[PDB]
Amino acid sequence: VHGSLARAGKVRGQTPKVAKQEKKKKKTGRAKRRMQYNRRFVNVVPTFGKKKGPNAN
């Protein structure tokens, strides 16, 4: 039907729950700006392609 007052809190109330698995911490602070300038500009790679961006899948 169209759900008058029932199934309120439905889609989070039935979702499969995936554990947040641990990682390394991020290099916070000054070193983030170190490593991401290093991510973008110190290696301007000659890979062409109309420049597919920074979350390529």
Partner: protein, 185 residues
């Protein structure tokens, strides 16, 4: 009712529009190739650069033969000649207008302890300052934003209390030599 100063102004400025792709890119290579911590202290020195141009163009809209820029622009120039962004014998109020923020991030303490051969790897040249290892002639200072003058520029050195200029090795050398003699007499 109080004996307080009250007086403060903001030092950095935030941009007109954010999220244009030809701003953050041409500003990111300030944050990395000169080794800074956050973009607020890029806007800081740029807003410092900005009002000097706003000063000088209040001054360039005046003519020839009036006394106020004779006091102002000369006192303007005898303060940024001594900081080393602009050399002495070619003093004009017109060369200052074509000037870029690459020179204000060149006259810091932090990039001059990289290019005077005192260290390596510009981010590391941040680290030595703040970790209390670098003195001015008599004064030890842990400030990367210390725009060190042209006058006191040949005088940056390691401290007398530094490892690299003095002694009493700190807690990593003391700890390792202790445990080796900590198995017998």
């Amino acid at each position: 009712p109080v004996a307080r100063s009250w007086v403060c102004r903001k030092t950095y400025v935030t941009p007109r529009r954010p999220f244009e792709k030809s701003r953050l890119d041409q500003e990111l290579k300030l944050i990395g190739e000169y080794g800074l911590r956050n973009k607020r202290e890029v806007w800081r020195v740029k807003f410092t650069l900005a009002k000097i141009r706003k000063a000088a163009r209040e001054l360039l809209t005046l003519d020839e033969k009036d006394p106020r820029r004779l006091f102002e622009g000369n006192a303007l120039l005898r303060r940024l000649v001594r900081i080393g962004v602009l050399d002495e014998g070619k003093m004009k109020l017109d060369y200052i207008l074509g000037l870029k923020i690459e020179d204000f991030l060149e006259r810091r303490l932090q990039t001059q302890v990289f290019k005077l051969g005192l260290a390596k790897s510009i981010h590391h040249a941040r680290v030595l300052i703040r970790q209390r290892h670098i003195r001015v002639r008599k004064q030890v200072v842990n400030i990367p934003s210390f725009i060190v003058r042209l006058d006191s520029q040949k005088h940056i050195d390691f401290s007398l209390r530094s490892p690299y200029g003095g002694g009493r090795p700190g807690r990593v050398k003391r700890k390792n030599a202790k445990k080796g003699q900590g198995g017998a007499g």
